[PDB]
Symmetry: C2
Subunit: 232 residues, 2 copies
């Protein structure tokens, strides 16, 4: 089972704390970070607001649950998560894995701001939304841009699915990996996700390339996710 | 312009001539086969029925239009098209390109036969439907099996789109159209396509590998499509 990183947020109105979940595993089934994987998530998830990036506090029954330090006003914020760089052997050579997740959260039933969500946060491989998904209806186009090391990434495959699309016969050894959208980015790194259903959506991109310092490691793999809501 | 291959058929009731179209270009816009491309489609499209595979005649206003030799009865049949194998240089090395198209045609309403459509026709990379698309409603699963050189192909990316999903880019980018479905085949080479809209669907698979005879060419690229109706 391949483990991937994503972020989820419960519905939050103005004045209350922001509850968020770090998904490490098979979307959308949240699972506790196992003991041997704890070191991979040594840094807490971050909340991105007008004042910048602030750490969140890991509160809750399970170790994947987080809450904001302070109550949040109405707006459109980001919540980011990172699988910290790890090394592993393959064949023989070294490969460094890094993973990223980003969730767009709208606090308030009428919040469709774009000042914060459209600014890159500096993830090695990042999906930067170019619009607020709260403005996107079913069948319309939601424009995003893929950045790698701060630059647009052309011809990258961006796939997308939603919670409930693939549910049949799910178990610990079954696929449930089907995507409801697939396209490639253009020369500006942009692509238009076209959602055919309302729900909780996850878009995925990945990039395998050479590690910059060949004297320490050979290959690099990045897996980046963007989660958001379509519809109300 | 990429230039992929697919097959289309018009609504045909039993007893009349089955008219079909060879699409060579950007789905779903049919275009006449250019002068310098005629040699690529040297063999006509084939109609697969109970009696087997038969050739179709290139009749019509445009060179991509084909008509069946004799009128067809009710049932479920296949219409197949082939981009004949061509060689080209890349970097340097040789690559052999082959493309295939298969359309499931239900001649007559209520016809949902599976004896013909589910039998492989021997394409180098082939999408063999394991069900008739007429039995599949929106949200249900349409199982297909991907075959390469006669054997099932695991972990192959099968995508699917439909006419009207992506409406843009006349010629400004000529990039491949967006897909409304993507998944990978299991160890039996099978995958369940989940269509979220009614209309004329095309599923796509591609396989790149080493050319068999390394003393003639190095690489081989195969592009295969399966077209059908949902609702
Ligand atoms: Ni509410
Ligand atoms: Ni009719």
């Amino acid at each position: 089972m391949v483990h991937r990183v994503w972020v989820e947020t419960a519905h939050t109105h103005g004045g209350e704390y922001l509850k968020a979940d770090l998904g490490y595993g098979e979307f959308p089934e949240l699972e506790p970070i196992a003991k041997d994987r704890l070191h991979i998530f040594s840094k807490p998830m971050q909340l991105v607001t007008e004042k910048g990036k602030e750490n969140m506090i890991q509160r809750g029954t399970y170790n994947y649950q987080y809450r904001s330090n302070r109550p949040v006003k109405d707006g459109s914020y980001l919540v980011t998560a990172e699988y910290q760089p790890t090394f592993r052997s393959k064949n023989s050579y070294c490969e460094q894995t890094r993973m990223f997740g980003k969730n767009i959260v709208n606090v308030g039933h009428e919040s469709a701001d774009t000042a914060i969500i459209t600014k890159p946060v500096g993830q090695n491989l990042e999906i930067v939304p170019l619009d607020n998904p709260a403005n996107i209806h079913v069948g319309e186009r939601f424009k995003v841009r893929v950045l790698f090391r701060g630059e647009p990434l052309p011809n990258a495959t961006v796939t997308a699915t939603f919670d409930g699309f693939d549910t049949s016969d799910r178990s610990k050894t079954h696929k449930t990996e089907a995507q409801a959208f697939s396209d490639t980015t253009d020369g500006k790194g942009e692509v238009d996700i076209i959602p055919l259903r309302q729900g909780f959506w996850k878009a995925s991109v990945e990039y395998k390339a050479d590690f910059p310092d060949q004297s320490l490691c050979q290959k690099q793999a990045n897996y980046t996710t963007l989660t958001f809501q379509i519809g109300h």
